[model samples]
Target: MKIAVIGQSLFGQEVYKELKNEGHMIVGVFTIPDKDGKVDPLAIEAEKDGVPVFKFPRWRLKGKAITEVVDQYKAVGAELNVLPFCSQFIPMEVIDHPKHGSIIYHPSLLPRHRGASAINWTLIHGDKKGGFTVFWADDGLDTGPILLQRECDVEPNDNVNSIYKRFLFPEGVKGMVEAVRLIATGKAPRIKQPEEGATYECIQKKENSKIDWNQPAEAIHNWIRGNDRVPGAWAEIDGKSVSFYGSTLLENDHFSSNGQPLEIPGASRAALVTKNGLVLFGNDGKMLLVKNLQFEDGKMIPGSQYFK
Candidate 1:
């Protein structure tokens, strides 16, 4: 199979390598433009392998496909387009150009999480099960018919980084390869996505991740872990702002205050610096302990050390 991989980052790089290892002829590699002189690993690896690499800032202009860009894409003579982790909005011209069309890897099950921040939303919504979907790319956003799907457990302490690193990242790579193999053997299936459980969430951002102390401890904990490493869930403390990380819910009887819990006069909530971490009190008397904390423009440090 002659494939054109359109993606970026370490996941994209690994997918490229896997495809090559399976004897697929990677005709071209398309990825995002370099940032601050740092080239994407996918682009870097493609260059080393002597494969043609294309970096376009945008494939379309004013909601229309760029003529020259489309021509450049067509020149690759790709039999299939495999998008492992594409952030760019790929135009239909390129997606539909290849004989096998384009197949994209979405980090969550189709229809359930149909947006860019699938993993974040998965954790935010506290879904018990999370998975990835490989599907034929169409004009709609992740509304494409499925080629294959795989499920994984969404553990209690799982964050975006943990979930991807533990399950989605590794298994997703193999999933892409399997999808391509099915295409090569002409056994690919396109099951229409059922709209019953469909959902779409906007990209998670700092503005949307402000921690609300009024919420339940479990909800707050989920919010903290959902945005664990990126756009970390933040709150105001001592007239300054700080972000939370490595959150673990500590129910009423699950924690000890060491005979010294921080007291907030006239307020039901409090935060205490414990040996294990920084324990935060909720309105319902439940608690959550975060291992690390970071102030705006400051480095992350032990929550206990920061609070102390």
Candidate 2:
């Protein structure tokens, strides 16, 4: 099957490799333009394989498809389009151009998390189950009909990075290949996503990721873990903004090696830098140990070494 791939980052690169290795002819690659002298990995991989790659900044200009871009896309003669981790607003002209139309790989199950930060919201909300969706692309935001979905447990200690690397990333790549195969075999299903559990969250950013120590310990831990390595969950510490990472919950009954109760050194709330980690106290006095702390303009350091 001849296919066009549109996306960026390692996910895109892996999808391309998997599809190509499975003997699919990747006709063209569409991805973001070079950023700050760096190139997208997908673009690099596509170019290496001699697949025509386009780095258009945008598919539309002033709400209309750019004629040249559309023409370039059409020239590829792609029967299908695979969108893996694509962020740019793709024009309908291109999405609807391919014979098989377009299918997208979204990080969460459809009709539930229908936004850019789907994975983040999944962890932040402490969802018991999490999954990814391959859906037929439509004009609405993630309102596409489902092609396939794979479910996974949102482990008790899972953070965004851990959950993605452990499950979503590897399985998602395989899922994409499986979706393509289904499409080629004329067995792909386009089941409409039910609206009962539909949700769309705004992208997570610094403004919304600030830690509120007054919240329950579990909520605080979720917030930190959800934004683990990007737009990191932060709070003000000694007048400086600090982000927390690699968090683990320490319930009230948790004890130390010597069987003595672990000491939390602050009053009602505190950020105690300990030899083990940065222990923070919630309003309920439950503790969360953050393994690393990072200040703006500085690298992440061990929470225990924040003083050093």
Candidate 3:
């Protein structure tokens, strides 16, 4: 299958490489434009493979669709369109231009986490199970029929980077690869995605990452873990903003008063509200310990080391 891959992240680069390695011809690629005077890494990586790249600021210019872009996609004689981590609003003209239609990668199982922040929402909502879906692309927002679905466990210790590294990213890459294989072999199945249990996650703003000390330890932990890589779960400490990482649930016996530091099981050293984290009291009189934390101006060091 000669497929045109439209993508803008590492996922896109890997999908293209996987297909090209599997002996499928990749016609060309479309990627996000250079930003802040730096080029999109995916575009640069795709170029390394000698694939034609289309770098546009947006799909539609001046509220009018660009026919030339469609012509470019059509000129490649593409059998299909593979979209992975593609943020662009692809037009139907380009999607229908391919012979086998387009297959898109979504981080969440369709209907749930359908919106852009699929990854952030899954962890923020503390969903124990998370997965990826490769589906047929349509006009709806991730409402397309499923081609393949793969599941992975969301562990208590997993954070954004760990989750994607272990689960969604790998599975999504494999799913897209297998979806292409199925399409090439004429075995792709188009199952209508059920509306039941369907939901959409709105954009997770930086404000949503604010830490509420009074909330349950689980919620606070989830927020911290979920907001990784950007706008991390933060709190106002000592009149300065600080973000937390590497959180741990504390046993009731571990609770402390007077906000003093103590030796923690897995920490290099510990103190209440140290550079690493603080021991916060829950309504239930239990405690939550964050093992790692950072202030905006300070590099991420041992929370204990950051103790003033």
Candidate 4:
């Protein structure tokens, strides 16, 4: 099948290579324009493979520029289009242009996490299991028919980076390729998502990433892990905003309430005295043995270096 891939980042690169390896004709690649002039790996790979590449400004739902680009790709006789991680409104024109239409690989199960930052929200919501879905694109935001779905176990120690690295990133590639194969062979089925099961969430912004100490240690721990790496969960220390990363939930018995040590003045170590263990706060409250970190305008240092 002649395919046109639209996406950005490392995920897009993976899809491009996989489809090319499977002998599909990758005619063109579309990616987000680089405002800061950073080299886009996906576009770079597409170029090396002799695939035509174009970068358009972030797609607006209604715009002349996007419509023209859609028309250009449609004119190329591309049979299918795959969206790996493109962050733009795919307007109906582009989605409906190709012969096989378009398929989007979302990092979470469809109807459940139907928005950007699905992984982050899963962590913030404290879900124990998360997965990805290959869905047929539609006019609504991720409100599309599902083509393929798979589940991933979220470990207690998993964070945003870790989960994506271990599960979503690699498995997503396989899932997308499989879905494409089914489509090429005319065996793919579209499952209608249940209305009751549908849910939607937006990207975590600064207001939502604020740490609330009043919540239980475990809840806070999940928040930290969910916001890892991007838009990291932040706390106000002495009225100054600071981000955290590695952390572990200490049992309540680790310290007394008076000695819980929620915050260490001018330091990074803080712990909650719980009945079973002391829940320590590390970078973004990740529940792992505090390993390494850095402060604003400071070099990365060992966890023990800042521990009192």
Candidate 1 vs 2: which has more TM-score:
1
What tens digits encode model 1's per-residue C-alpha lDDT throughout 177-289?
A: 99999999999999999979999999999998888777677887898999989879888777677888999998655354573365433325667878878888777878888
What is the per-residue lDDT of model 3 for residues 1-308, given as tens digits with 9 covering 90 to 100?
79888887788888888889999988888887787687777778778988888886666678667877777767888899999988888888887788899999988877688988888788888988888989998988899999998878888867888989887887788889999999988999999999787998777676777766565667766777788756677766666777777766776434444455543333223337544356655444555666666778647755565555
Off by over 4 Å in 3: 254-271, 274-276
The total of clashing pairs for model 4 equals 21
List model 2 lDDT by residue over 198-231, tens digit each: 9999999988898766777788889899998887
The lDDT, on a scale of 0 to 1, for candidate 1 is 0.90
Candidate 2 TM-score to native: 0.93
lDDT of 4 by residue, 230-300 (tens): 66776665456656666555532443444334573432356543333334544444433334444554455
| Each prediction's whole-model lDDT (CA) | 0.90, 0.88, 0.78, 0.77
Query: For every model shown, what is its TM-score relative to the native structure?
Result: 0.95, 0.93, 0.88, 0.85
Best by lDDT: 1
Q: Sort by lDDT, best first.
A: 1, 2, 3, 4
lDDT of 2: 0.88
lDDT: worst 10-residue window of model 2: 257-266
Give candidate 1's error at residue 136 in angstroms. 0.6
Residue runs of model 2 more than 4 Å from their true location after superposition? 253-268
